[PDB]
Amino acid sequence: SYYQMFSELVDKLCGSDECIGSGSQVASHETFGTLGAIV
Amino acid sequence: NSAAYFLWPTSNLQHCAAEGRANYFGNLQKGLLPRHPGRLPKGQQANSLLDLMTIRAFHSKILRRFSLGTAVGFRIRKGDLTDIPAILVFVARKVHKKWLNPAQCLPAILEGPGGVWCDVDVVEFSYYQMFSELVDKLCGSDECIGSGSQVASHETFGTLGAIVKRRTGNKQVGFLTNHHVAVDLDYPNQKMFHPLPPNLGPGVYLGAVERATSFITDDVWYGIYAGTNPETFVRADGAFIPFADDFDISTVTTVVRGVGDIGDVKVIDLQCPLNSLIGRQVCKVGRSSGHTTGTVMAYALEYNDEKGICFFTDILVVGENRQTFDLEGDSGSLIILTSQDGEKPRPIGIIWGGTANRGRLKLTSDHGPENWTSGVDLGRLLDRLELDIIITNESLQDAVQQQ
Amino acid sequence: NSAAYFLWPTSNLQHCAAEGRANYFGNLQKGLLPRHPGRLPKGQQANSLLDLMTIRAFHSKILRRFSLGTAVGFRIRKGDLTDIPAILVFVARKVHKKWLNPAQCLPAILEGPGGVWCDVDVVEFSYYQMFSELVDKLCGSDECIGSGSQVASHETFGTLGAIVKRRTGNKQVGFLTNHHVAVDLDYPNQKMFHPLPPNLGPGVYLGAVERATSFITDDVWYGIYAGTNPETFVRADGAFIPFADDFDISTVTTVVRGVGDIGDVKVIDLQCPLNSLIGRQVCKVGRSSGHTTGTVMAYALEYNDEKGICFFTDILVVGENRQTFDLEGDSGSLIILTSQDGEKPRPIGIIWGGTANRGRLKLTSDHGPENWTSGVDLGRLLDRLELDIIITNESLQDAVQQQ
Amino acid sequence: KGDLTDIPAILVFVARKVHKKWLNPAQCLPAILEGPGGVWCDVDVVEF
Numbered sequence: 001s002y003y004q005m006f007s008e009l010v011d012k013l014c015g016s017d018e019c020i021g022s023g024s025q026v027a028s029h030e031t032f033g034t035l036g037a038i039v
Numbered sequence: 040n041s042a043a044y045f046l047w048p049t050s051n052l053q054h055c056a057a058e059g060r061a062n063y064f065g066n067l068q069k070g071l072l073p074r075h076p077g078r079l080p081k082g083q084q085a086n087s088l089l090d091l092m093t094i095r096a097f098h099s100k101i102l103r104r105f106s107l108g109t110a111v112g113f114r115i116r117k118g119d120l121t122d123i124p125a126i127l128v129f130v131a132r133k134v135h136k137k138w139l140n141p142a143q144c145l146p147a148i149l150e151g152p153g154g155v156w157c158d159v160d161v162v163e164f165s166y167y168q169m170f171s172e173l174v175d176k177l178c179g180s181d182e183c184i185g186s187g188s189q190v191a192s193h194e195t196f197g198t199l200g201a202i203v204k205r206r207t208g209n210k211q212v213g214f215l216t217n218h219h220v221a222v223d224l225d226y227p228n229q230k231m232f233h234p235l236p237p238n239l240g241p242g243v244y245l246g247a248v249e250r251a252t253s254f255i256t257d258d259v260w261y262g263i264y265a266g267t268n269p270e271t272f273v274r275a276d277g278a279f280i281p282f283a284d285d286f287d288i289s290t291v292t293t294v295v296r297g298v299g300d301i302g303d304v305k306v307i308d309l310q311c312p313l314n315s316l317i318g319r320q321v322c323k324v325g326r327s328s329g330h331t332t333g334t335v336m337a338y339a340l341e342y343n344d345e346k347g348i349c350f351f352t353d354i355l356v357v358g359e360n361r362q363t364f365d366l367e368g369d370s371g372s373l374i375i376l377t378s379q380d381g382e383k384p385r386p387i388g389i390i391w392g393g394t395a396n397r398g399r400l401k402l403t404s405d406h407g408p409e410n411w412t413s414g415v416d417l418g419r420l421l422d423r424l425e426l427d428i429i430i431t432n433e434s435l436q437d438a439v440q441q442q
Numbered sequence: 443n444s445a446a447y448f449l450w451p452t453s454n455l456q457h458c459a460a461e462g463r464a465n466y467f468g469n470l471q472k473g474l475l476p477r478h479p480g481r482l483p484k485g486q487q488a489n490s491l492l493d494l495m496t497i498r499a500f501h502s503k504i505l506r507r508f509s510l511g512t513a514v515g516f517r518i519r520k521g522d523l524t525d526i527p528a529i530l531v532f533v534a535r536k537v538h539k540k541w542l543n544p545a546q547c548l549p550a551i552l553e554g555p556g557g558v559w560c561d562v563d564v565v566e567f568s569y570y571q572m573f574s575e576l577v578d579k580l581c582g583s584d585e586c587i588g589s590g591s592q593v594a595s596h597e598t599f600g601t602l603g604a605i606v607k608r609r610t611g612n613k614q615v616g617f618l619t620n621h622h623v624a625v626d627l628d629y630p631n632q633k634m635f636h637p638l639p640p641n642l643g644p645g646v647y648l649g650a651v652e653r654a655t656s657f658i659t660d661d662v663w664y665g666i667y668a669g670t671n672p673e674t675f676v677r678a679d680g681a682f683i684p685f686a687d688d689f690d691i692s693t694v695t696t697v698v699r700g701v702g703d704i705g706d707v708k709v710i711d712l713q714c715p716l717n718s719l720i721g722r723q724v725c726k727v728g729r730s731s732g733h734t735t736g737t738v739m740a741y742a743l744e745y746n747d748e749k750g751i752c753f754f755t756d757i758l759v760v761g762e763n764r765q766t767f768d769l770e771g772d773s774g775s776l777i778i779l780t781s782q783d784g785e786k787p788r789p790i791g792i793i794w795g796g797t798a799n800r801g802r803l804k805l806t807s808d809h810g811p812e813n814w815t816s817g818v819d820l821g822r823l824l825d826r827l828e829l830d831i832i833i834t835n836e837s838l839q840d841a842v843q844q845q
Numbered sequence: 846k847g848d849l850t851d852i853p854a855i856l857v858f859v860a861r862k863v864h865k866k867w868l869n870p871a872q873c874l875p876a877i878l879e880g881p882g883g884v885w886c887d888v889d890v891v892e893f
């Protein structure tokens with residue numbers, strides 16, 4: 001065929017931590033996204 | 040003998056209140072009384088609702104710059120109540136201190152005129168079916184009329200609030216409910232029936248609407264000024280309906296089914312210690328939810344809309360064990376303090392009912408958000424409406440003769 | 443000094459009216475007074491509104507079996523008015539006599555108690571932007587305030603009805619409009635501004651709403667019984683707003699722009715000859731249509747809904763030369779009789795405003811249907827509201843001092 | 846009056862145009878503006 005979680009880690013990844021790394025939340029004037037990698 | 044016209048309230052027609060507000064804020068600003076952020080004596084720490092409310096009124100500009108709302112109460116730490124008086128500020132998202140510039144960060148101590156000081160606390164916040172024998176009894180299967188029964192008009196439904204009598208005139212007997220049943224600017228809704236209106240099913244005719252109130256100026260209600268905005272209101276819903284002279288009054292009971300017998304109304308005083316209302320346990324019986332229990336969390340919640348209007352609410356309540364305290368269609372039920380030792384339960388409030396009368400707040404990271412409910416004080420509403428409550432059947436009969 | 447509660451009308455709380463209705467219909471049915479369909483003397487032909495209304499009330503069962511509504515007036519033949527009194531019955535479709543069974547066919551002569559007789563007429567019926575200098579002047583480009591100007595509240599708009607003063611108390615001065623601006627069961631709308639509210643544009647504050655009325659029992663309004671249904675109402679919209687004490691009263695004019703000077707209100711009597719109201723020419727000046735003229739067609743139109751409720755309307759008006767008489771947003775304008783020789787024009791009515799306040803009727807087969815408009819009587823409304831009208835500036839100043 | 850003049854000006858667009866009697870002094874716009882160096886121009890009001 002071709003056709004919401006609550007924990008401490010999710011809270012840390014969304015702005016409750018003290019560092020920036022893989023999995024963090026990034027945003028622009030409309031949408032959101034996940035940080036891919038450090039290069 | 041009067042004609043067929045409505046009359047409007049005459050309590051919001053004085054400019055002296057506005058002039059007094061302006062003078063009060065002017066003399067408050069004249070007496071800035073600056074003090075260095077040094078040692079604060081514990082003797083002038085707040086111990087009542089009045090101190091917190093006046094402090095919040097004084098510092099209402101810096102707190103409202105980045106907020107959704109404010110309230111007063113105790114400090115919440117790690118999902119459990121403390122015993123330290125505090126002012127609660129509501130935000131959409133809670134972040135670490137490293138991503139905040141100095142302007143946005145909030146202080147930890149506030150001080151008002153006279154040297155009184157309090158704390159600051161930050162909470163995350165949001166502004167956006169039962170089957171049993173009791174529910175069947177409340178909806179038309181019983182043989183009596185009392186608190187929790189279903190009442191109806193030509194469009195909507197509601198819950199019977201209380202059995203009351205008037206203070207002036209001939210001291211007539213009736214009941215207290217919410218005004219939503221009585222929307223008579225676009226269509227006639229002025230008769231009440233139990234359990235159904237004539238064009239939907241069988242029923243019996245109860246009476247006709249006599250009094251209602253929605254909005255009151257905060258100066259009359261609280262007695263003091265609590266804001267700077269010239270246009271402020273407090274929501275106080277109520278309606279009074281007297282019994283018709285053809286009604287058979289032998290079928291009325293003064294007992295609250297599922298609770299028992301109740302005492303007299305309990306008045307909320309703004310100079311009592313804070314622990315007599317914050318943290319207590321309450322219960323209710325409602326037409327579409329049955330029997331439920333919960334805990335009181337906050338008082339005097341403030342909200343501001345996009346058209347420059349401020350609104351206030353009295354009681355904020357949260358359910359227990361991640362269970363909702365109430366459903367839709369339960370508006371108009373009593374809120375009663377549970378008895379801890381000996382004495383009988385006493386009612387303190389009434390469920391308000393509206394559109395934004397509920398929402399979600401977060402306390403712990405392990406689970407999801409919880410729901411909350413708003414409530415209206417009872418003693419002030421009774422004083423405004425000039426009505427008294429009846430708690431015994433002997434007094435009910437005595438009033439029936441004495442009318 | 444009163445509290446912040448509304449009061450409700452006390453004129454619809456008497457069962458003696460229902461008992462009188464029952465007794466009246468019982469004794470009317472007891473006195474059937476049968477008569478053979480023989481020669482009817484011309485001396486007992488109806489000559490007033492009362493006779494037609496009582497005949498329609500007597501025979502209200504057979505007429506309502508297959509109908510959409512009824513009214514009284516003259517007979518319409520080939521698209522032109524006759525001079526023979528008649529009762530008008532409205533149907534959805536008009537067919538030839540050959541496709542009708544005897545039960546459905548309507549008689550040509552009706553007779554009521556006392557021997558009075560009248561005719562029957564059949565009409566087809568349905569229940570479902572201007573640029574000029576005057577429109578610009580009425581919307582904020584002028585230097586004065588008068589009839590036809592634009593007034594506004596926090597949501598809606600409206601037209602200023604008239605300049606009036608109260609009869610009792612201190613005899614305060616204000617203006618008369620429609621109550622739609624003043625919907626205060628769901629949101630505060632109690633201040634008035636010209637031309638715009640503060641959160642939409644510049645404007646000046648006028649006053650606050652004091653009185654309003656929507657529904658009146660027909661027994662009080664007409665003075666007689668006109669139906670058998672126990673639940674009957676008559677729509678009588680109105681609202682009175684007095685001028686604030688800070689308002690500058692030197693900018694008010696009593697002239698109706700586009701017409702001139704007007705006389706005193708003209709009362710409609712139910713015992714005058716029929717030709718003093720039927721067939722006359724009328725005119726109006728409205729905020730969104732300008733100046734228009736039309737002709738009066740019917741009186742006392744009756745309607746019945748699916749929930750067993752009957753409603754009445756007073757005036758039915760039709761425009762001239764296949765032009766609409768009014769648009770949407772013109773509710774609250776005066777309806778004035780045009781002067782035929784010598785005397786000044788006099789107002790008789792006010793445009794009601796609602797949702798089903800317009801529709802289509804057919805008179806000739808060559809063209810399409812035409813629109814019609816409803817109106818409310820003025821003298822009875824003024825009597826119910828206890829207000830008086832001011833027509834000269836000298837009297838305006840005299841009332842200003844005498845207050 | 847719906848016709849072009851030959852006087853340089855700055856045009857300001859408003860939703861509604863009203864008489865001067867219903868305007869408080871704060872909302873009313875001046876008829877002459879001046880900038881640095883002493884240069885001056887007019888003000889005109891258009892509905893838009």
Ligand SMILES: Nc1ncnc2c1ncn2[C@@H]1O[C@H](COP(=O)(O)OP(=O)(O)OP(=O)(O)O)[C@@H](O)[C@H]1O
Pocket residue numbers: 105114115116117118130132133134135136143144145159160161162
């Ligand atoms: N404007 C703001 N928006 C979001 N977060 C803020 C803002 N101002 C401060 N904070 C953060 O909110 C937190 C303050 O938490 P609070 O005062 O409730 O502490 P607490 O009650 O002792 O702890 P707990 O988090 O266990 O309830 C700090 O981490 C602070 O950086």
Ligand SMILES: Nc1ncnc2c1ncn2[C@@H]1O[C@H](COP(=O)(O)OP(=O)(O)OP(=O)(O)O)[C@@H](O)[C@H]1O
Pocket residue numbers: 508517518519520521533535536537538539546547548562563564565
């Ligand atoms: N229930 C009914 N539904 C539809 N048509 C009906 C009904 N009862 C009677 N009619 C028809 O309506 C007509 C009555 O017309 P009416 O009484 O208005 O006559 P008129 O005024 O002299 O003529 P005109 O048609 O020129 O106005 C007849 O043709 C009759 O058959």
Ligand SMILES: Nc1ncnc2c1ncn2[C@@H]1O[C@H](COP(=O)(O)OP(=O)(O)OP(=O)(O)O)[C@@H](O)[C@H]1O
Pocket residue numbers: 644846847859861862863864865872873874888889890891
């Ligand atoms: N903020 C405002 N909103 C609405 N109207 C305003 C405002 N400020 C000024 N006005 C009005 O706009 C008008 C100014 O018109 P304007 O400067 O275009 O004059 P003009 O070009 O000489 O005349 P014309 O109207 O014939 O084009 C005045 O009537 C003034 O009262």
Ligand SMILES: [Mg+2]
Pocket residue numbers: 114115116117160161
């Ligand atoms: Mg905390």
Ligand SMILES: [Mg+2]
Pocket residue numbers: 517518519520563564
């Ligand atoms: Mg005809």
